From a paper:
S is the major surface glycoprotein on the SARS-CoV-2 virion and is involved in viral attachment to target cells via the interaction of cell-surface-expressed angiotensin-converting enzyme 2 (ACE2) with the receptor binding site, at the tip of the receptor binding domain (RBD), in the S1 fragment of S (Lan et al., 2020). Following attachment, cleavage of S releases S1, allowing a major conformational change in S2, exposing a hydrophobic loop that executes fusion of viral and host cell membranes, releasing the viral genome to initiate viral replication (Walls et al., 2017). In-depth structure-and-function analyses of 27 potent RBD-binding mAbs isolated from vaccinated volunteers following breakthrough Omicron-BA.1 infection reveals that they are focused in two main clusters within the RBD, with potent right-shoulder antibodies showing increased prevalence. In summary, we have presented a structure-function analysis of potent human antibodies induced by Omicron BA.1 breakthrough infection in SARS-CoV-2 vaccinated individuals.
We have determined structures for five mAbs within the neck/left shoulder cluster: Omi-2, -9, -12, −25, and −42. Some broadly neutralize all VoC, while others are sensitive to the mutations at residue 417 and 484 found in Beta and Gamma (explained for Omi-25 in Figure S4A).
Residue numbers in the entry:
A (entry chain H): 1 to 140, 146 to 228
B (entry chain L): 2 to 213
Write the structure that this text describes.
């Protein structure tokens, strides 16, 4: 299938730089023009940049003109966006999107049919605090287990299960901004009961601001 | 530039709702290249309309496009539960594109969904760190309004309560969570603690105990 995957996200201070990548597959990347579109929190979509198949046509939004640098490597089927001198208003979710037809403006003519999952970019001068991860054990025909991502700052944290292999039955929840100024989060998976002593459930918490990466095995309580 | 879009739209199940998209003579009113996109929470946008009124393969006939002057409109007839999402319009502007502000579409008057509540006691690892947290999790409910009440035995809790704002998940349904913070000595002092989830007049209660 057609597929686009953005990488290179994270938190970075106002004025610093950050480079985004978009890996393409499933379609002839050699001929199509690709574009960047961001989604700012609370706002809507906003077009960032565009580049033709041979880099002969390049365009930027006025808010990032002379600030971002778009490029591509057709041999690696990869699109890039070099973001320098980042501002707080650059905090957004950056999407990699291809057009319906390989032309430059054709993505505007006939729409952008394929989008990637996006890569989060945060531009703030805030402080940093790593989260404590505690397991929410189940009672040893389904059961609910999870782990508690407690007292971190700032947003966000990513929680996967079994290095990403456990996606079915995984319940997602938003974070509380507690009165202490710190966030807290919890992730929970619903699994069949007859597998508590058989399978291993590990929640992978990644808080890039603090460079904290915790893997907590969640196992049934011993009453 | 800026393409004006109403922040929110609404329509009842089976009814119709039109979402306007207003630009200028150099974008919306200058070309017949207006696109419409649908975005469910947690997922990438999906092309619904291109060239003002053309539908790609995979888009139902319920979505239809039109344009009149500097104003493009998206009409969704026979509104359905899965149509609740965000909708952005796009337009060509001369080697550049521009999106609308976006409109949240709420489908009013649908069958309710009862929340699934799960309450977790404090873990032994948190208690060994001289802390204690009760984690109440509420998911798969609709509509989004919900009240969460904590109880020590039968009496209401004094302080230490944090609760999320209900937000829709990838399955297009709402989910929230509430956190009751206690010291380890408070946790072992009461017989039981209860999370009370009131949703659309119905109340659910889950209970944990330090002994059980």
């Amino acid at each position: 299938e057609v597929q686009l995957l953005e990488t290179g996200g994270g938190l970075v201070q106002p004025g610093r730089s950050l480079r985004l990548s978009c890996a393409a597959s499933g379609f002839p990347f050699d001929d199509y023009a690709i574009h960047w579109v961001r989604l700012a929190p609370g706002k809507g979509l906003e077009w960032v940049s565009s580049i033709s198949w041979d880099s002969g046509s390049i365009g930027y939004a006025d808010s990032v003109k002379g600030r971002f640098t778009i490029s591509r490597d057709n041999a690696k089927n990869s699109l890039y966006l070099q973001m320098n001198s980042l501002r707080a208003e650059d905090t957004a979710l950056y999407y990699c999107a291809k057009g319906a037809f390989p032309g430059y403006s054709s993505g505007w003519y006939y729409g952008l049919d394929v989008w990637g999952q996006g890569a989060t970019v945060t531009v703030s001068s805030a402080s940093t605090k790593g989260p404590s991860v505690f397991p929410l054990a189940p009672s040893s025909g389904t059961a609910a287990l999870g782990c508690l991502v407690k007292d971190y700052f700032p947003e966000p944290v990513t929680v996967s299960w079994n290095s990403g292999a456990l996606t079915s039955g995984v319940h997602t929840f938003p974070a509380v901004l507690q009165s202490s100024g710190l966030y807290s989060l919890s992730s929970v998976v619903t699994v069949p009961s007859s597998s508590l002593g058989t399978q291993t459930y590990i929640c992978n918490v990644n808080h890039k601001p603090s460079n904290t990466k915790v893997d907590k095995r969640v196992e049934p309580k011993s009453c | 530039s800026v393409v004006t879009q109403p922040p929110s739209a609404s329509g009842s199940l089976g009814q119709s709702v039109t979402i306007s998209c207003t630009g200028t003579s150099s974008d919306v009113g200058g070309y017949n290249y207006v696109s419409w996109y649908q975005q469910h929470p947690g997922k990438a946008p999906k092309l619904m309309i291109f060239e003002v009124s053309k539908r790609p393969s995979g888009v139902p006939d319920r979505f239809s496009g039109s344009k009149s002057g500097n104003t493009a409109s998206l009409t969704v007839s026979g509104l359905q539960a899965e149509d609740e999402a965000d909708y952005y319009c796009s337009s060509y502007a001369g080697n550049k594109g521009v999106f609308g502000g976006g409109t949240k579409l709420t489908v009013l008057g649908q069958p309710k969904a009862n929340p699934t509540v799960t309450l977790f006691p404090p873990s032994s690892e948190e208690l060994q760190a001289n802390k204690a947290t009760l984690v109440c999790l509420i998911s798969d409910f609709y509509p989004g309004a919900v009240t969460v009440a904590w109880k020590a035995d039968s009496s209401p809790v004094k302080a230490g309560v944090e609760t999320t704002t209900p937000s829709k998940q990838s399955n297009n349904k709402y989910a929230a969570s509430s956190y009751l913070s206690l010291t380890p000595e408070q946790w072992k002092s009461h017989r039981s603690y209860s999370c009370q989830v009131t949703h659309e007049g119905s109340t659910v209660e889950k209970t944990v105990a330090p002994t059980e």
